[PDB]
Scaffold this active site. Structure first.
Site, PDB file in Angstrom:
ATOM      1  N   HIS C  63      58.506 -42.618  -0.569  1.00  0.00           N
ATOM      2  CA  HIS C  63      57.443 -43.620  -0.746  1.00  0.00           C
ATOM      3  C   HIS C  63      57.674 -44.750   0.231  1.00  0.00           C
ATOM      4  O   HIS C  63      57.319 -45.899  -0.054  1.00  0.00           O
ATOM      5  CB  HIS C  63      57.383 -44.123  -2.181  1.00  0.00           C
ATOM      6  N   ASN C 136      53.088 -42.141 -10.537  1.00  0.00           N
ATOM      7  CA  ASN C 136      52.387 -41.472  -9.405  1.00  0.00           C
ATOM      8  C   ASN C 136      50.921 -41.278  -9.789  1.00  0.00           C
ATOM      9  O   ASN C 136      50.557 -41.452 -10.948  1.00  0.00           O
ATOM     10  CB  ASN C 136      53.000 -40.113  -9.094  1.00  0.00           C
TER      11      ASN C 136
END
Ligand code: HDD
Ligand code: HDD
Ligand code: HDD
Ligand code: CA
Ligand code: CA
Ligand code: CA
Ligand code: CA
Ligand code: CA
Lengths: 678, 674, 319
Positions: C63, C136
């Site tokens: 990420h 997520n």
């Protein structure tokens, strides 16, 4: 060749280069004119000074002060009947080791001879991976749960406003913690005994402290304790000696070890275990998961597994000793953990803390940390990555690397495996097991197992430290805890600090004893090789130098380290009176040709007033063998107030008879009749 | 090699910890089959600690790049001009490692951003590592290293929202360019095709700064380093670069990797300009000023040797990510100059490696190690990998017999500062007035481009400045551009709806210089590695036959051929769904696939109009395009067109098409201003 | 004012200083003469370039590419009936938040519109401590044991000899791992759907993925799933559009978010849970400990807990 010879850099020849091989100079800055300012384009200057500016790494969070050496472990047998451990699987099988010894509380520049717990950390570079036993010279620990480690260590380290005092538990915070956290009593009694001020790293034992498991290839397990038993014997300093030695020679233990190895007197230990069944975890009247308890040897005898010998000093202290990064997580097939909540939390700490020390994740690549067998895994990248990995598919499961590396487990590839009989049951709890609650019986067991003079030394250590505690609440609280181990200890300690001991509380009092914990009781030393004899002589009498030379030959024959002391150096004189001290010797001999130096009127610009006599007096008062060789002993012994008939006081004309007597005195090591008892 | 010694083979064996204990790493240790994970799981924690710590800071500039190993070979004994050992004999071979890069973008940004590009070469010489840390543009934006954070902060993303990535097309950058007129020369290069090179192999390398060659007699001359591509100079067009940014962010690194794997390792002639110390201010500018080139008309190139890249790395992170270049890596025979940009670089590249490596022993990383013995008194530090045997690491000593010995001009082949160098005057934070002409050489560069190249540069400025929100920054940009060329300011101003300021002719001139034009550099000297897309169909066996015949005729000549069709099979490399014109240097349609090019064409296997859009894009972007064996009418592509091929024959189609690949771009397809 | 106003540094006025407040210049090096070499005693130069040289920090291991904003959470009710959590203990109770949205595989300069799983990480600065939900935009994960995470990520990230390809699972290693580790199938289908190429961070949901517990002050517990339901609606790009956007505007999602906030269109989510008894851990046909499974909403409906609104952009992205 060192086991690390592939990493050695020789600078015995050649021209100075940069780190990238460009020949350079490094003695004068580049300047704009002969009296000009220095130029930024001086790369010679900046690479050298950047390196210097970045030499230091964080000291270890504990055990910052220590010293290490290389050696060999040799197995006495094939131990496959109790453990799958490869390094133990054959008679005579040899495995390289590295050992570091240490104190606990002091910073990396503090004195070796502080009163403290000591580390004894051993790496076995086995043919199935590095195996570390990260032990101490005391078999029990202060606390019962790893989560309390910062509490203990904050309390014994210096007060955090002013960072005072260094390398000492002799302050309010430490004794506050001890008296509020009664688990501390067992280790506290060990640290206040002579085990707190060992004579050398070679004269102490090592202990794993925790119960571990031995696991066979069939999956069966036994509970074990590790004991490393000194083949040099056990010996201590006395406190009033240790305090002077901390100033005269802060490096005493590391010098003693280094010198023993260089002289071919590399120290040895029998690596031993107590082995008991899984069914005996709560059979001995305490819990084998509790790291504040020993298994008395009367209940489970020591089995000798093999020999540990240290026989090679490092080449570069920083690179090898400062950088060695031990972990109890460095485990091999055949060994397993136990649910000891102190061991459990350690496994986290020692992997994490190396990130602080090394500054990056590739610390296992440092030469001293590398294994001596191949590494096959999918760990990658990170700062300081030295390896160039060929496998371009470092994930499992894969087909593009044909499924390699393969998983290792109990049934394939000699994998590590958790002991398969291990279970857990019950609530997820932050609760202490009531089986851990007796904090006082075993401290009493230890105290009971010391000789009378040894008990006095322990009382006197507590009297010394507790008298420096400023708080009257903390001193009273300390007496409350000591009183639960022994009313006699509480009364004797209370006498020094002007408080009354609380009334006897006999809940945990008993008269049981256990073998092998006393130093005074462990009899004469098995060897006197390496012990230090100072011969006090004079340049003012050629016959005093002749006596000293004859004494040297006879003592050196027997492997003693002889120092001849005189006013000034010359051939056959090792040391001046100015640099000499009784803390430098295990015994002192005056040659009677030097008796004039012991007179009250003796004075010289070459050494402090009274130095010759003070060396003899200190040695006598600290319990060492002392004597006068040549037949005229009266002038010296009378100046020193030392009685000719005293035990460990020698007076002989004959050099041979002097040395035979004096050598029995060095094996006795300390004459305990010179210490007053309550 | 330090590299060979540290290679780790995992082609066989059981999984181990980093300390050689065999382990597993696929299931966590738990308290029962549905239970919580145990802290005593060392297998879990050592693996996840390593993963957690994999990343290191990206480079502060040139974060996005790719490297390769090779060799440098000297053409001669250059003792007459330099003491440098790697240059001291005909045929002398020195290992090299090169990293190419953009400048502004972070690590994962696209290769085909418009930017300055790095070209950093390490020579592992027998007298130490020598780095030439260059760019593909021979001049730099600024005249003093102290300004570097100002330039880089302005070009990098706006720091409240970190927008935009890998682009000078924002207010802050153009604010800086317009307020700091020294930027004009490099700005004009970056707005040319040199901002969007076709590949690392199709650009040159420049040391930028004047350096010195120093002889063993102590005499010195001033030099410029030029690495001249043997592949030829080539650019993308801007639209193509934008699409490539999205379709293949790895285009330049893939191009380099593939050329090396195919035995087409790129080559450069390592060249210098050489001039006397007395010529520092003889060419109408100051050779200490890194915003100026020496026109080749004034000082020709001397070819010193061959640089060839021919081996890819084994581990990208360990070799390419960790290589730590420094201009401070200098060897006897080379010296610095008082260029204030070079002077401050020397500090930066030693210091920054502490940030990247996290400790001071970064020269011990295998890619950073030399290929000669190290003898010095540097000690300790985090990550120390050596075990030093000399226990007296101080000078002067007797206890190590006075070793190591000092090296200098007289003895030990020491580095030495050129002994003719002097300084005189006040200690000043003052710019030399000899540095003050910011506009003549930008105009020289602009004048030296072809008309369509001038149009591309105007159109790059029109594109970027139109995205500047501030009307005041846009006006200030026109004020600066106008000092280089009134025509450029007028043409740019027209796109943004502002008036150009009146002509200011102070620095205007009509002089030109050879060797800076891409469009002018003539056909490529080799078409090996260039990419041909053959657009075929699985419908018609004749289409696949035609494609296979073309394939053998083009692969013969070292062209990388992709046959494209609706679906994969034997002979088809790529689907229409994954294909794009940015993937090819030329596009051939086999006439058996004619049916795919109709506006009526549709398939669930690729987007509406994909086959025709590949051909139409290839044509619009200037590439050689043709039909072998209707298609030209659909594409609105004229059969008489330069770089448009129409042959029934495969042999004559190919002979013609390959001339087109050498021409590379057909620039008559681009509109010019009136 | 920002929740971080106490830490703000104003440079809208004043004279340049070192970091220790000494007024200085920073535009010309100190030299031995006007055409001379730069001096080591130039502390102005070295402090400035040292700072520059050390600006970068390691990107996140996953990420790495992402963007954030400040906002507020407001509870719809007193939820003491199901949790002791203080931030949920009263109708209308407000807690500051910070959210970061992200891709997974790409490095910090990669395109927002890569096909990927996306992060949705929310911090609640509660009056009983910071509470993070690190979620997520897809409710299921590729793998069933954390120890496999480096395997998954090595396989999806670029091949380690040449570091190709960026921000993409379209290479042999990733599909080798998917085909050998069948747990991957559920998240793989989500990532190959439009959920792999969302129209914006504002047009995707957030999921905690794992089953967590809600624990009452009386000690009783229930099993929950977090679901942040977009008030803007669900929307995707089409793949060919995403590929072009990657090149034309790598910053598309971060700009979309920044602009929505500056226009007064700060995005909103209903923060929801599914709530089931401990006895239902195996009642739905799968194990609630298995992060590759959803609880179908037909089995356990969503309860709205409160409103998450992002309405303030950062002042300094890096900080
Ligand atoms: C939860 C934390 C914790 C606990 C409960 C302990 N230690 Fe520890 N110990 C550390 C955390 C730690 C550490 C912070 O991780 C150190 C500092 C340097 C290092 O590598 O590990 C360390 C160092 C260290 C060293 C120095 C190793 C060397 O020479 O480099 C020894 C000998 C020990 N410890 C021994 C013990 C023993 C015998 C313990 C109890 C039975 C013990 N420690 C409990
Ligand atoms: C005062 C600072 C400064 C200035 C004026 C420059 N640079 Fe630089 N450059 C750096 C500070 C820096 C740096 C911050 O130190 C970097 C980042 C990573 C590194 O190793 O050094 C760097 C990286 C870097 C790289 C990447 C090397 C690699 O691939 O790892 C190249 C090619 C250049 N620079 C080239 C140049 C050229 C040709 C310049 C002008 C002629 C220049 N730089 C001026
Ligand atoms: C065992 C390791 C591991 C596993 C199994 C996962 N992650 Fe993770 N994740 C990390 C290890 C990690 C990390 C390496 O620790 C990161 C990198 C940066 C950070 O702070 O944590 C991270 C970052 C990270 C971020 C970025 C936070 C931010 O914006 O700064 C998000 C949203 C997620 N993860 C979400 C998840 C989800 C929803 C998972 C499965 C349900 C998941 N991760 C499994
Ligand atoms: Ca205190
Ligand atoms: Ca004793
Ligand atoms: Ca801007
Ligand atoms: Ca791959
Ligand atoms: Ca969709």
């Amino acid at each position: 060749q060192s086991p690390l010879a592939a990493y050695e850099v020789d600078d015995s020849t050649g021209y100075l280069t940069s780190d990238v091989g460009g020949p350079i100079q490094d003695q004068t800055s580049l300047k704009a004119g002969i009296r000009g300012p220095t130029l930024l384009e001086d790369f010679m200057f900046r690479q050298k000074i950047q390196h210097f500016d970045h030499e230091r790494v964080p000291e270890r969070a504990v055990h910052a002060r220590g010293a290490g050496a290389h050696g060999t472990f040799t197995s006495y047998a094939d131990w496959s009947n109790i453990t799958a451990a490869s390094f133990l699987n054959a008679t005579g099988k040899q495995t390289p080791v590295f050992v570091r010894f240490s104190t606990v509380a002091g910073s990396r520049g503090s004195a070796d001879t502080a009163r403290d717990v000591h580390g004894f950390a051993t790496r076995f570079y086995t043919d199935e991976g590095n195996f570390d036993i990260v032990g101490n010279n005391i078999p029990v620990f202060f606390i019962q749960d790893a989560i309390q480690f910062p509490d203990l260590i904050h309390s014994v380290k210096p007060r955090p406003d002013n960072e005072i005092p260094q390398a000492a538990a002799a302050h309010d915070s430490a004794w506050d913690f001890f008296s509020q956290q009664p688990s501390t009593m067992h280790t506290l009694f060990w640290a206040m005994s002579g085990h707190g001020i060992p004579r050398s790293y070679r004269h102490m034992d090592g202990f794993g402290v925790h119960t571990f498991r031995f696991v066979k290839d069939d999956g069966s397990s036994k509970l074990i304790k590790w004991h490393f038993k000194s083949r040099q014997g056990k010996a201590s300093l006395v406190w009033e000696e240790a305090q002077v030695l901390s100033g005269k020679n802060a490096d005493f233990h590391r010098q003693d070890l280094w010198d023993a190895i260089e002289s071919g007197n590399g120290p040895e230990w029998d690596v031993c275990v107590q082995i008991v069944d899984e069914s005996q975890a709560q059979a001995f009247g305490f819990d084998l998961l509790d790291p504040t308890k020993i298994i008395p040897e009367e209940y489970a005898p020591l089995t000798k597994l093999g020999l540990l010998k240290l026989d090679r000093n490092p080449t570069n202290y920083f690179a090898e000793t400062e950088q060695v990064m031990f972990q109890p997580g460095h485990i091999v097939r055949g060994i397993d953990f136990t649910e000891d909540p102190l061991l459990q939390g350690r496994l986290f700490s020692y992997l994490d803390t190396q990130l602080n020390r090394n500054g990056g994740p590739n610390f296992e690549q440092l030469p001293i940390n590398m294994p001596r067998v191949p590494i096959h895994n999918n760990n990658r990248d990170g700062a300081g990555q030295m390896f160039i990995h060929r496998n371009k598919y470092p994930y499992t499961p894969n087909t593009l690397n044909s499924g390699y590396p393969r998983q290792a487990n109990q049934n394939a590839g000699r994998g590590f495996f958790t002991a398969p009989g291990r279970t857990a049951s019950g609530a997820l709890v932050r609760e202490v097991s009531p089986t851990f609650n007796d904090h006082w019986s075993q401290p009493r067991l230890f105290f009971n197992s010391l000789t009378p003079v040894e008990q006095q030394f322990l009382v006197n250590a507590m009297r010394f430290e507790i008298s420096l505690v400023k708080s009257e609440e903390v001193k009273k609280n300390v007496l409350t805890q000591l009183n639960r181990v022994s009313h006699d200890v509480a009364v004797r300690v209370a006498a020094a600090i002007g408080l009354g001991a609380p009334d006897a509380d006999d809940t945990y009092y008993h008269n049981n004893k256990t073998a092998g914990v006393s130093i005074v009781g462990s009899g004469p030393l098995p060897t006197i090789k390496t012990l230090r004899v100072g011969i006090l002589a004079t340049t003012s009498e050629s016959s005093a130098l002749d006596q000293a030379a004859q004494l040297r030959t006879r003592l050196e024959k027997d492997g003693l380290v002889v120092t001849v002391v005189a006013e000034t150096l010359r051939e056959g004189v090792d040391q001046t009176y100015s640099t000499a001290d009784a803390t430098g010797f295990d015994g002192v001999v005056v040659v009677d040709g030097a008796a004039a130096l012991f007179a009250s009127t003796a004075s010289s610009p070459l050494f402090p007033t009274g130095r010759p006599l003070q060396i003899f007096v200190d040695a006598y008062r600290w319990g060492k063998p002392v004597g006068v060789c040549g037949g005229k002993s009266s002038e010296v012994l009378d100046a020193a107030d030392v009685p000719e008939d005293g035990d460990g006081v020698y007076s002989e004309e004959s050099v041979d008879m002097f040395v035979e007597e004096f050598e029995k005195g060095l094996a006795t090591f300390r004459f305990t009749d010179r210490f007053a008892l309550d």
